[PDB]
């Protein structure tokens with residue numbers, strides 16, 4: 023229904039300087055994506071907390087609210103209410119700036135996830151490449167948290183956070199190059215409007231590549247070494263007490279949600295009940311919008327579910343067993359996939 | 375029922391079913407049965423209706 | 430409910446002895462204790478499973494005999510009453526001295542009646558008893574709930 | 577590195593508090609009587625504790641700097657505090673915090 | 687020399703994926719099995735016929751034998767007597783146990799001849815202060831709790847009190863009994879053929 | 880004569896809101912508390928998705944709900 027048009031025209035009817043009107047529509051989706059991001063964090067926390075109890079014949083929170091619905095609310099409000107402590111020789115500027123640096127770009131990368139056509143913020147012609155770029159800023163914040171702490175116990179485990187995050191960006195890049203072949207570019211709308219009746223069937227290998235490189239962004243118990251609670255307590259996090267630890271926590275879960283939404287838009291699509299949709303008009307547009315949003319969230323939820331379900335199925339790996347995936351299983355296979363897709367697009371340019 | 379009087383239990387919905395035990399103390403309708411048996415003497419409060427004043 | 434004023438304090442000042450039927454989670458009752466402390470009342474919970482005759486520990490002066498372990502042969506301490514000592518150690522602008530009992534189920538009818546009758550005598554003194562139960566925090570005078 | 581004796585309401589170190597750090601110097605022997613406010617202190621009894629500490633380090637100490645010895649000093653101070661708290665100079669705080677009678681319950685001295 | 691290396695490589699990969707999917711299916715199977723959780727405050731668990739919780743005490747049956755102190759590992763119970771002079775009787779003037787020190791070995795219960803001193807199923811002891819655990823003679827009898835007679839509890843039996851073959855104690859008939867016959871029933875059965 | 884399409888679209892997505900975060904969440908609560916112990920492994924994930932898609936609502940009217948077990952009758 024082009025809500026931008028009516029918002030600007032109704033607001034341009036009582037004046038308000040039409041350029042200013044186009045300026046004043048900016049913050050609405052820019053904060054709506056923050057709303058759904060925070061909600062996705064709350065949902066991811068509650069989901070992990072209840073499914074990690076289902077796996078174990080356990081029952082998660084039910085005394086917080088009805089079903090633990092208000093558990094991360096309690097967590098966040100507490101961590102606001104907690105004291106913050108700045109240890110003895112730690113720096114004052116870098117300590118309270120590390121978590122901001124590792125948290126910000128994950129939010130900033132929500133300017134590309136569609137949720138529906140013309141239902142996103144500012145489709146960039148670069149798109150996913152900007153995500154691959156902004157994701158490489160996190161190790162700076164992690165090394166900042168390591169250096170800005172007298173805790174050798176922390177820095178010894180903050181360098182290995184800039185060893186895996188600096189290792190699973192190359193195949194993460196190659197698996198999306200393999201999609202940039204097909205889709206005439208890099209914009210998400212172009213990656214997905216190429217699906218009108220999915221890339222997973224034609225990228226059976228790059229799926230594993232992207233999906234192993236996304237889980238291994240210092241997130242999950244298959245690796246999550248920099249928070250290896252048993253190996254060395256909380257790594258770089260153990261001196262962060264109040265809302266700063268909440269920033270780290272938030273950042274992990276919101277990055278997981280972003281990975282799920284991004285696998286959805288890349289390989290499956292944030293539309294397309296798998297029949298060739300649009301074969302069957304504002305009252306119909308508001309229906310297909312809801313349908314596309316719903317199916318997007320279905321696939322994102324399935325990937326969040328599988329991701330949390332590996333956390334309780336897959337014991338961790340030291341650091342050498344880890345880095346012998348990168349450069350020895352993900353990078354050669356990503357190169358092979360790239361060359362394969364290139365050769366097939368050269369021979370069979372149809373279907374790509 | 376009164377103190378010092380051995381009793382037994384008549385309640386299939388109780389783990390202490392058909393145990394004989396000596397009453398110890400009575401306050402407010404609930405009576406403390408004392409199960410002299412095994413090694414350690416156990417003490418539990420039963421209602422007067424769960425019991426049966428055996429001889 | 431999700432928000433409640435100070436009618437609990439009026440009910441307590443009126444009856445003298447209430448009986449809370451809070452849930453077995455212990456998360457939604459201390460706020461009323463706060464509402465009492467927000468007026469001037471001072472609290473002391475002392476966990477009834479551990480109180481004796483309740484005429485020797487509250488009114489009169491009684492003898493506590495600590496734990497000897499082969500060493501330090503039997504000795505008494507004679508701690509003073511719980512209700513004529515904290516009641517005299519109040520601040521100046523003190524409305525009264527409420528009394529909280531966490532586990533009231535373990536006590537009996539007789540001392541419930543005693544605590545109720547003890548509200549009228551010894552004036553600046555009130556009582557509350559957390560007899561666990563209902564899934565919504567409701568209360569009742571403690572002269573009631575018995576006879 | 578530090579050599580401390582951390583009981584309750586007596587914490588002894590071996591450095592010099594500059595602003596909140598400690599900086600072990602090997603000769604300053606700070607003290608931190610009752611941080612958690614289990615007791616309500618006056619100006620006199622606290623000075624008596626101070627003087628006990630001074631005439632307990634200097635008057636009887638000429639041996640090594642082990643934690644054994646500082647722990648012994650802390651024990652002597654924590655018994656001196658019993659003495660002050662029984663005789664009736666200082667008393668418990670009564671505040672709406674924990675109120676756990678670590679030292680003793682109140683007697684009447686019959 | 688080189689092809690065999692790639693085949694062993696792919697074989698290791700496939701075996702790893704298979705052994706991961708195995709645990710995947712296992713954990714996805716555990717999330718239909720009913721929770722064995724015991725939702726305690728509303729779904730409390732019933733103690734056994736020998737659990738050793740709080741000690742009981744009668745004032746009328748004691749005769750001040752001092753066995754309780756002479757047998758406790760740490761000589762804990764505070765018996766206090768005065769020996770009135772009618773003929774010989776030790777008069778018991780006070781009796782306490784500090785349950786912040788007691789170990790619940792119940793040897794006290796074991797060697798009390800008068801059956802005065804017993805164990806109760808109270809495991810819900812806690813205070814904001816440890817000078818309240820020192821229970822007096824009139825605060826040790828005190829008529830224990832009896833979990834089942836609680837309007838807001840769904841009691842559960844434990845593994846020794848469930849019917850034969852049964853393992854959990856959650857969704858049970860209202861007439862279940864332990865495993866087998868009592869010896870009285872066996873005797874009256876053999877007597878009647 | 881408010882048959883106009885603009886007003887009716889405003890009304891219908893306002894009603895899609897009021898249906899999204901007043902009504903259906905209670906239905907999720909009912910269907911979930913009904914079968915939490917007796918559920919399958921696929922239906923469990925489906926239920927969790929029903930929670931996810933409507934989660935912004937369950938934050939609002941959860942404080943006004945009590946799943947305490949409604950104390951049993953004791954005499955019989």
Ligand code: SF4
Nearest residue numbers: 748749750751754798
């Ligand atoms: S063992 Fe029994 S009779 Fe002897 S002192 Fe203890 S309670 Fe009394």
Ligand code: SF4
Nearest residue numbers: 758788790791792794
């Ligand atoms: S349970 Fe053990 S420690 Fe406690 S009174 Fe009995 S014998 Fe002594």
